UniProtKB/Swiss-Prot annotation, chain A:
Catalytic activity line of the entry: S-ubiquitinyl-[E2 ubiquitin-conjugating enzyme]-L-cysteine + [acceptor protein]-L-lysine = [E2 ubiquitin-conjugating enzyme]-L-cysteine + N(6)-ubiquitinyl-[acceptor protein]-L-lysine
Gene transcribed to yield this protein: Rag1
Source organism of the structure: Mus musculus
Protein name listed in UniProt: V(D)J recombination-activating protein 1
Annotated GO biological process: adaptive immune response; B cell differentiation; chromatin organization; DNA recombination; negative regulation of T cell apoptotic process; negative regulation of thymocyte apoptotic process; positive regulation of T cell differentiation; pre-B cell allelic exclusion
Superkingdom to which the source organism belongs: Eukaryota
Gene Ontology CC terms: nucleoplasm; nucleus
Keyword set, alphabetical order: Chromatin regulator, DNA recombination, DNA-binding, Endonuclease, Hydrolase, Isopeptide bond, Metal-binding, Multifunctional enzyme, Nuclease, Nucleus, Transferase, Ubl conjugation, Ubl conjugation pathway, Zinc, Zinc-finger
Effect in UniProt of substituting residue 313 to A/C: Impaired cleavage (both nicking and hairpin formation)
Effect caused by changing residue 319 to Q: Impaired cleavage
Binding site for a divalent metal cation: 200, 308, 562
Length: 608, 270
């Protein structure tokens, strides 16, 4: 104390004089600054940063929301977290992670069913309460032995109680947009939300915990997404909010989930009917809800697009994918689209589909089945989901990839010269192709193609390698030029907002696709004279119109929900109470918390 | 001039560099070329002279002492006892740092360079008399279990995998992971810590097969492959002080789940 004080009291009082005469005498500021500088000079800035923090007066503790973000976005348990918490608190004295109870109390403020909200007019058939959490998905389905045996499990939210929370977590992110777009913050116009709906079975979720094989089980998740929030200020509308990366796995929120085969039609309808009830109810009403102080009014638009091919083929009520009728958007038989190549439109809506099923069931013309089926263009069931039609992206690209992979395997045998080989030359061709590719481009052998493989194989390098394997020469043009046409075509739908990103390939798509068409019809007509596959009709005839109809083609895809599948399994065996009736409550709740935005706003701290 | 805190990065640097230079050269010729240490001392005095012992005490803690932040060993301990991955730990660390300003957890490389002190083959040791048929180096970590088994198409076909520590290096690491416990023991037993009597260790060894540890990959069946793990346990350390042996360390929970240390493991059958 006095020891060091008198050890250099000379220089102490001297620097006091100097700080008074020049720096005025803010001894605190100058002394601290010179110590931080003398410490930084020698590159030990850890102490510099922590000391600046402790002098600035920032508590080391964390708001419960942050530690919750950590626990949910790092897949910790509810006891491992306790381990970490108690060890940190014991080591460094002051607690840095909040306890568990204070984590749950801040968990509740984000799960759905916590805020007041009122509809105008009140939704018919929808309850008025505002405190509904995780509702049993079965919807009070009477299950007694005298009735139909039903055994699946299902959990869900309501639909309004989920939209409310999805909006009130992004309150700040919509207000910031309102500011950035030069708008008076205190505005309560009729906001309009755009919500993309999706669904896709993700079977083979079980585990042979008993080491006994041959026991499968499937599951289904019905989930939605907010994609654009728009207000009509003055004369026109403005994009108060838009989604950065729509078809990813962190911005698609689950709404219900169940353990039932995606084709078990009866159970599927029995569980998914209430959702469509609520969805049709809240399509002609307004939701009043305070949004950062003053109240605001919301209205919605629901586009159902994230449906693969099999679902949209089944629930919308068409004959299965092996039909003579191919396009879910127009009514043409493969043996007709293969001839009239690209001049179609979209003429298969949902209400048309429904009245067509009606004219099927009633059969007013007293005509036989074989021509009635043709009259009703292949509708044979009652559709129960209003879904907009549009090409998927992920599965379309994978299909095209496997498609021209098979054409490569075909061109090995050069069957155009000698046709009609048997199914052993074919296996030999496949083996030769796979070995040559593994030797040249090191493309591993795989049976079920993955998007990574699909991107790996659509390259000029690999087509040149196979072109150097194959004997003849005309095949060189007839394959390399086809492949470069395909690559010139792909981005206008692979993109996420190609309305302006690649606004040249779009305007050239007409030529870029009709040349593909003509050459497939001329130099390859030895395969495409009759049967043409479906996706090679979709990409050919519809996308240059679906773009102008909707906008993106990538953003309206199911890549997001699909990517989520993995997460399921993880949560299932790191967060579950082992009751087959809470094993879905917990999974749904954790998936909800994960897919929030008010949480990821913390995990993106280091950037900003 | 406005305030050294309101200015930009080196704004204050140029503003006060005059006084900085004069008194820093005076002080480095005073105490032989050192400014940061005496500068923090005078900072301590000139600040806590305004009745603010709090920040001075926490500063004395954080500098040349523990307190805030975590020793790399601690963060390693929690990372391995909570079965966290690597990228997960990175996420937690970076977001904690970005939020609370300070740096509580340590980075990754500063964790590898701090786990390299607990695996075998880091310490120096000397056998005497030397060990027949045993190498003498002290840099033997993981080594292949097959021990250089000729595996070509002309000899007995082998298709197993095995990894192991050398016995001596693993054993010396077991000893240098309980130095503190044996010291506390001989202290409590009223001995002298400056003692290097010939301690006698008593070890326990075990080997039990753990068959059926495969799992289905992708979406399909699995194959019944077994596995074997050879492991030991330090169990009782003693020393013969004076005329009789005195017990210096015993295991609290002998057959516990976390005091049998692995030594070798293989994907074979028993
Ligand atoms: Ca599917
Ligand atoms: Ca899928
Ligand atoms: Ca056993
Ligand atoms: Ca055994
Ligand atoms: Zn069509």
């Amino acid at each position: 104390r006095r020891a060091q004080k008198h050890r250099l009291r000379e220089l102490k009082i001297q620097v006091k004089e100097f700080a008074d005469k020049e720096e005025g005498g803010d001894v605190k500021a100058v002394c601290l600054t010179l110590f931080l500088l003398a410490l930084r000079a020698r590159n030990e800035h850890r102490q510099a940063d922590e000391l600046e923090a402790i002098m600035q007066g920032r508590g080391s503790g964390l708001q419960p929301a942050v530690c919750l973000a950590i626990r949910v976005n790092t897949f910790l348990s509810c006891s491992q977290y306790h381990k970490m918490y108690r060890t940190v608190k014991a080591i460094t004295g002051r607690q840095i992670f909040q306890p568990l109870h204070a984590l749950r109390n801040a968990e509740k403020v984000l799960l759905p069913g916590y805020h007041p909200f009122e509809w105008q007019p009140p939704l018919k058939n929808v309850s008025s309460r505002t405190d509904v959490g995780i509702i049993d998905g079965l919807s009070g389905l009477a299950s007694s032995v005298d009735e139909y045996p039903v055994d699946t499990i299902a959990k869900r939210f309501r639909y309004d109680s989920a939209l409310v929370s999805a909006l009130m977590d992004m309150e700040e992110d919509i207000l910031e947009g309102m500011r950035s777009q030069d708008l008076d913050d205190y505005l309560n116009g009729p906001f309009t939300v755009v919500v993309k709906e999706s669904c896709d079975g993700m079977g083979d979720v079980s585990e042979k915990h008993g080491s006994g094989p041959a026991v499968p089980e499937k599951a289904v998740r019905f989930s939605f997404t907010v994609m654009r929030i728009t207000i009509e200020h003055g004369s026109q509308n403005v994009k108060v909010f838009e989604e950065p990366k729509p078809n990813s796995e962190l911005c698609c929120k689950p709404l219900c989930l169940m353990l039932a085969d995606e084709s078990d039609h009866e159970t599927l309808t029995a569980i998914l009917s209430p959702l469509i009830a609520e969805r049709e109810a809240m399509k002609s009403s307004e939701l009043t809800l305070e949004m950062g102080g003053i109240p605001r009014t919301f209205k919605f638009i629901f586009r159902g697009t994230g449906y693969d091919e099999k679902l949209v083929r089944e629930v919308e009520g068409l004959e299965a994918s092996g039909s003579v009728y191919i396009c879910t958007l127009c009514d043409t038989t493969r043996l007709e689209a293969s001839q009239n190549l690209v001049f179609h439109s979209i003429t298969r809506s949902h209400a048309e589909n429904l009245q067509r099923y009606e004219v099927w069931r009633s059969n007013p013309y007293h005509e036989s089945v074989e021509e009635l089926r043709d009259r009703v263009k292949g509708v044979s069931a009652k559709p129960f989901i209003e879904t907009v039609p549009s090409i998927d992206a992920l599965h379309c690209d994978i299909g095209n990839a496997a498609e021209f992979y098979k054409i490569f395997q075909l061109e090995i045998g050069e069957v155009y010269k000698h046709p009609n080989a048997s199914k052993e030359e074919r296996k030999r061709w496949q083996a030769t192709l796979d070995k040559h590719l593994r030797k040249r481009m090191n493309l591993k052998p795989i049976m079920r193609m993955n998007g990574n493989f699909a991107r790996k194989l659509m390259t000029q390098e690999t087509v040149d390698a196979v072109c150097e394997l194959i004997p003849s020469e005309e095949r060189h043009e007839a394959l390399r030029e086809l492949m470069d046409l395909y690559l010139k075509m792909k981005p206008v739908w692979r993109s996420s907002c190609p309305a302006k990103e690649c606004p040249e390939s779009l305007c050239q798509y007409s030529f870029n696709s009709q040349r593909f068409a003509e050459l497939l019809s001329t130099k390859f007509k030895y395969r495409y004279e009759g049967k043409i596959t479906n996706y090679f009709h979709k990409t050919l005839a519809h996308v240059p119109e679906i773009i102008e109809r909707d906008g993106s083609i990538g953003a309206w895809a199911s890549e997001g929900n699909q990517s989520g599948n993995k997460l399921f399994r993880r949560f299932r065996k790191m967060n579950a109470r082992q009751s087959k009736c809470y094993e879905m409550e917990d999974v749904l709740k954790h998936h909800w918390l994960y897919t929030s935005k008010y949480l990821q706003k913390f995990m993106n701290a280091h950037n900003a | 001039r406005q305030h050294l805190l309101s200015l930009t990065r080196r704004a204050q640097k140029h503003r006060l560099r005059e006084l900085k230079i004069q008194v820093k050269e005076f002080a480095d010729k005073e105490e032989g070329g050192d400014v940061k240490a005496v500068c923090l001392t005078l900072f301590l005095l000139a600040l806590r002279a305004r009745n603010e012992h709090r920040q001075a005490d926490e500063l004395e803690a954080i500098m040349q002492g523990r307190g805030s932040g975590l020793q790399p060993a601690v963060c390693l301990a929690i990372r391995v006892n909570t079965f966290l991955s690597c990228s997960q730990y990175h996420k937690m660390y970076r977001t904690v740092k970005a939020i609370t300003g300070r740096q509580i957890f340590q980075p990754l490389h500063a964790l590898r360079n701090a786990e390299k002190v607990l695996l075998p083959g880091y310490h120096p040791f000397e056998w005497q008399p030397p060990l027949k048929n045993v190498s003498s180096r002290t840099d033997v970590g993981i080594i292949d279990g097959l021990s250089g088994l000729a595996s070509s198409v002309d000899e007995y076909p082998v298709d197993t995998i095995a990894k192991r520590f050398r016995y001596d290096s693993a054993l010396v690491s077991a000893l240098m992971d309980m130095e503190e416990d044996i010291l506390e023991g001989m202290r409590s037993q009223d001995l002298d810590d400056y003692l290097n009597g010939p301690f006698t260790v008593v070890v326990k060894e075990s080997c039990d097969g753990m068959g059926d540890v495969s799992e289905k990959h992708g979406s399909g069946p699995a194959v019944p492959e077994k596995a074997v793990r050879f492991s030991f346990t330090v169990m009782r350390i003693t020393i013969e002080h004076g005329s009789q042996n005195v017990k210096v360390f015993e295991e609290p929970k002998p057959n516990s789940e976390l005091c049998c240390k692995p030594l070798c493991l293989m994907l074979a059958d028993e």
